[PDB]
Design an enzyme around this catalytic site. Sequence first.
Site, PDB file in Angstrom:
ATOM      1  N   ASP A  35      48.485 -22.160  66.804  1.00 17.61           N
ATOM      2  CA  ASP A  35      48.039 -22.546  65.460  1.00 17.61           C
ATOM      3  C   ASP A  35      46.717 -22.101  65.060  1.00 17.61           C
ATOM      4  O   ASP A  35      45.758 -22.555  65.380  1.00 17.61           O
ATOM      5  CB  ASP A  35      47.792 -24.201  65.374  1.00 17.61           C
ATOM      6  CG  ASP A  35      47.618 -24.465  63.897  1.00 17.61           C
ATOM      7  OD1 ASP A  35      47.515 -23.433  62.948  1.00 17.61           O
ATOM      8  OD2 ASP A  35      47.312 -25.793  63.609  1.00 17.61           O
ATOM      9  N   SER A 199      42.565 -11.194  50.045  1.00 18.14           N
ATOM     10  CA  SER A 199      43.768 -10.489  49.812  1.00 18.14           C
ATOM     11  C   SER A 199      43.311  -9.780  48.512  1.00 18.14           C
ATOM     12  O   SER A 199      42.611 -10.480  47.612  1.00 18.14           O
ATOM     13  CB  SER A 199      44.933 -10.947  49.693  1.00 18.14           C
ATOM     14  OG  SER A 199      46.101 -10.299  49.222  1.00 18.14           O
TER      15      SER A 199
END
Length: 330
Positions: A35, A199
């Site tokens: 994770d 992004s």
Amino acid sequence: STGSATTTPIDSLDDAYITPVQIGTPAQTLNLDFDTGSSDLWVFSSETTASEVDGQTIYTPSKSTTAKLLSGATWSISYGDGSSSSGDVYTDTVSVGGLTVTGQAVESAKKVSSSFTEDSTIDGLLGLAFSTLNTVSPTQQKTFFDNAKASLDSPVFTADLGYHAPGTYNFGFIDTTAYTGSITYTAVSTKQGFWEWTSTGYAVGSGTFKSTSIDGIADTGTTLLYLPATVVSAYWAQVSGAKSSSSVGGYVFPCSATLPSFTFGVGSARIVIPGDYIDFGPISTGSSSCFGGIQSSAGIGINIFGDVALKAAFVVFNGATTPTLGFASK
Ligand SMILES: C#CCN(C)Cc1nc([C@]2(O)CN[C@@H](c3nc(-c4ccccc4)no3)C2)cs1
Ligand SMILES: C#CCN(C)Cc1nc([C@]2(O)CN[C@@H](c3nc(-c4ccccc4)no3)C2)cs1
């Protein structure tokens, strides 16, 4: 040193991926969910409340000659879906794919919430976010990666998740055969303890690219891609009959549909998520309503590039002094 381990989807939907991890002496192999959005290595154990164990493999520290109680240490964590676990702590030898850390904090669950009990295939979690998020008290502990980092050939690990197929976690090296073209690296902020990046925009299907900054985290422990409501609406508007369902808890679409791809920007590069990766299948067996793999982040407070996005790429988690994330097509 290096390590390399195969990671395998737990089910036909790629709801999560499990990776075998050796703990203790003799080795006890548990299948952990790696994770990159949390920082605790915790396991089902001989201490876990019996009624909360249903098929998991347990760690038994009393059978490990290298286990030591980390006296007085406790831990307690919640996850973004509301799941949780807590317990006490041992140190022990932990190996992943041939890479060994001695003295790793292994957090033994005394209690786990229902979602963990129900996930018979997940024997615990191995956190790979920054150690500042680790929940052990009163002495915070380091992740497996942080402990291994100085010994690794290069202070990196890579995630190469498969679509309905196994993939690989590598530690300490970049497998140049595992991706096409170049890896585009982008800056990481550790201010929230995550692999947090920005992004450069998105496109839906064959559409033109929308340049827009989308802060979010690279999180192998989240199944789906969670993005701002504006972006998610623009995607689902291209699918006839798709709608957000309050009863289901997100966007659903007719199972008769063929989904468009979704592209996200990494610097001037692009990662294309095939439409099929966005299909999570019928909401219940036999239903003709299918669950979408792109969902709104509006109720979460953070955008999450989970497995839907990451499995379309070869991803480098570069833990050098100035951390970065790398993405390549594959
Ligand atoms: C809500 C909200 C705001 N924020 C807490 C969202 C975030 N949430 C996370 C993670 O809690 C860390 N990674 C993900 C993860 N969930 C699991 C897991 C859960 C249940 C069963 C099996 C595995 N494993 O990893 C979500 C990071 S930011
Ligand atoms: C088809 C099908 C099965 N079902 C009807 C739909 C699906 N549901 C999922 C979940 O991944 C399972 N848990 C849910 C959830 N996760 C989070 C969350 C995650 C990370 C950070 C913060 C919040 N919030 O809700 C969605 C896969 S397919």
